[PDB]
Amino acid sequence: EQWVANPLKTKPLAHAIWDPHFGQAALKAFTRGDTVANISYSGVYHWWYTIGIRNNVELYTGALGLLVLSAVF
Amino acid sequence: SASYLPSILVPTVGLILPFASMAILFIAIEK
C-alpha cells in the first residue's frame, strides 16, 4: 500500500531477507524502508492493483482465503 | 508486523528441516 501511494516512484518489495551471512556491508545495500526486502520483479502488485486491492488487510483476507482453498483441495 | 518470526522460521526450515527430512526419507528407504 506504500507502493499504491506512489506507483511510479517506489520500487515494489518482495519478501524480506533473513540472511545470517550478510555481515554489515550487504545490509546497507537493501534498505527500502525498515525491511531489507527484495525488489519484487514479478508484476504482482500491478495485477493486485488492477484487481483493486489497495490494502494489506485485503491481502491477509485473501491469503487466509487461499489457505482455506488449499486445505479444501 | 511480527519482526521476529523469520529469526525462528528461516533456520528451522532452512537447516533443521533438511535434517529430520533426511532422517524421515532416508530411514524411509528402509521403512
Binding site: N56, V57, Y60, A63, L64, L67, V68, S70, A71 | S1, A2, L5
Partner: peptide, 27 residues
C-alpha cells in the same frame, strides 16, 4: 502489518500441513 493475523495464518497452514501429510501416507 499486524501480529495475530500472522498466527492465524500459521495455524491454518499447520492444519493444511496436517492435511498434506494426511494425503502423503495413503497414495
Amino acid at each position: 502489518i499486524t501480529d495475530n493475523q500472522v498466527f492465524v495464518a500459521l495455524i491454518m497452514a499447520l492444519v493444511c500441513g496436517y492435511l498434506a501429510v494426511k494425503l502423503a501416507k495413503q497414495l
